[PDB]
Structure 1
């Protein structure tokens, strides 16, 4: 098995720049990999406070006691026992799938393929991270490993859900991570002008009415929904409440 740690160009990921010119790897090499994790750095000062706490604790004056308690309460096990357990599990068991899991995997694969196509036809360049049959094999092997962990001679929905969750995390963090990379913008400024004039601060309107009006006009549904959700993403004038029915202008 291959485990690789790599840095992007320009050091930091630089989300402002497109993903296509942030990763220098070709399409062939990434396809062989099947879990790619984009580890971004963030500043919110609460995770920072916690991390500073953990580091100063893990300083050798303190952690040498605390970790010992993890071997006294039975919360964590020693390294060599884990080594023996993994070799025993590798030698002993080799699970198998079930037809319901096969159907669920098929439907999930069709869904992610459709989503990739819908992103590509919008961005009109090839995706820098591909989705192919090797990824289906990847999810199958992840499920197999999950079942192998508990020595169960069969894999069921409990492991399939976890495998799909991990795959969705590792694909939404990287592939569908802002696929647009930031009619052009002319309709955007026209759109923002009218709702500001027509809709004052404090009230709300139905989504269906807005969609009807701006599909009747030249804006149409494809442009309005993205514009509406980015005005939401601006997160300074418009808020959503009560499911997707209420458009609240804070």
Structure 2
């Protein structure tokens, strides 16, 4: 089961940009992946000071390292134990969902489909697959396999819906239209397209004080999608 950490491009503007469209030219990657979490490490004021203070010292008298070690003792499961536990639960029991939980999730997914369609009436640029539903399922069974129980419960899923909801919230988050033209080029410039190619828009947008790589592609991908 693949766990992947991608690196996004250009920073915060990629959030200003459509949430997808990040990986290569294709969102399909993000479609295959169940749980996508673009993140923030907003240090609760005690974090940045945590790391800083840690850098300041980092010498004597191993007090901090010790503190880490008692954090390890107390730090819940010794994590050497956690492993053995995971093996245990993984081999022993295979969970199964309950019917009311099922119908619950039906309501879940149809509300998702409907509502977010309505959201996309405006052609709001972003998604929903039954694969995502199947994901939600696998989370429910996973967590059911935490409690080790042979059977699922409703509350048990009630967590999962909202967790994945946070994931959906993650799915949600030279002027473009001007460069988005290329249209003037596609027309009265080149019905063929040839001898035009990215190289042409390069000579057309090379000494016009104007075009970035992402800019050139964006407007291109845009018009490609737009249907112009």
TM-score, normalising length: structure 2: 0.63
For residues 140 and 46 of structure 1, do their structure 2 counterparts lie closer, same or farther at Cα, with a shift above 3 Å needed? same
Partner residue, 2:148: 151
Matched residue pairs, number?
228
User: Shift in Å at residue 4 of structure 1?
Assistant: 0.7
For residues 65 and 210 of structure 1, do their structure 2 counterparts lie closer, same or farther at Cα, with a shift above 3 Å needed? closer
For residues 221 and 101 of structure 1, do their structure 2 counterparts lie closer, same or farther at Cα, with a shift above 3 Å needed? farther
* 7-16 or 64-73, larger mean C-alpha shift: 64-73
* 214-223 or 16-25, larger mean C-alpha shift: 214-223
For residues 192 and 30 of structure 1, do their structure 2 counterparts lie closer, same or farther at Cα, with a shift above 3 Å needed? closer
By relative contact order (CA 8 Å, sep 6+), the higher-ranking structure is 2
Cα deviations across residues 11-44 of structure 1 (Å, max 9, x unaligned)?
4454333435544362332222100001136588
d(CA) in 2 for partners of 1:139 and 1:51?
35
d(CA) in 2 for partners of 1:162 and 1:207?
49
* 186-195 or 203-212, larger mean C-alpha shift: 203-212
Cα deviations across residues 64-104 of structure 1 (Å, max 9, x unaligned)?
55556646864422232111110011010111111110011
Whether contact under 8 Å (2:21, 2:27) holds in the other structure is: no
For residues 56 and 217 of structure 1, do their structure 2 counterparts lie closer, same or farther at Cα, with a shift above 3 Å needed? closer
For residues 75 and 117 of structure 1, do their structure 2 counterparts lie closer, same or farther at Cα, with a shift above 3 Å needed? same
TM-score, normalising length: structure 1: 0.58
User: Shift in Å at residue 120 of structure 1?
Assistant: 1.3
* 21-30 or 80-89, larger mean C-alpha shift: 21-30
Whether contact under 8 Å (2:136, 2:161) holds in the other structure is: yes
d(CA) in 2 for partners of 1:158 and 1:207?
54
Whether contact under 8 Å (2:96, 2:141) holds in the other structure is: yes
For residues 198 and 32 of structure 1, do their structure 2 counterparts lie closer, same or farther at Cα, with a shift above 3 Å needed? closer
CA RMSD of the aligned region, Å? 14.0
d(CA) in 2 for partners of 1:110 and 1:166?
17
Whether contact under 8 Å (1:71, 1:78) holds in the other structure is: no
Partner residue, 1:53: 53
For residues 107 and 11 of structure 1, do their structure 2 counterparts lie closer, same or farther at Cα, with a shift above 3 Å needed? same
Instruction: Tell me if 1:161 matches 2:152.
Output: no
Residue ranges of structure 2 left out of the alignment (5+ in a row): none
Residue ranges of structure 1 left out of the alignment (5+ in a row): 177-182, 238-250
For residues 143 and 59 of structure 1, do their structure 2 counterparts lie closer, same or farther at Cα, with a shift above 3 Å needed? farther
What are the equivalent positions in structure 2 for 1:91-240 lying under 5 Å apart?
91-125=91-125, 130-175=127-172
User: Shift in Å at residue 206 of structure 1?
Assistant: 57
d(CA) in 2 for partners of 1:44 and 1:159?
29
Partner residue, 1:179: none
Cα deviations across residues 170-200 of structure 1 (Å, max 9, x unaligned)?
1112235xxxxxx999999999999999999
User: Shift in Å at residue 205 of structure 1?
Assistant: 58
Whether contact under 8 Å (1:101, 1:160) holds in the other structure is: yes
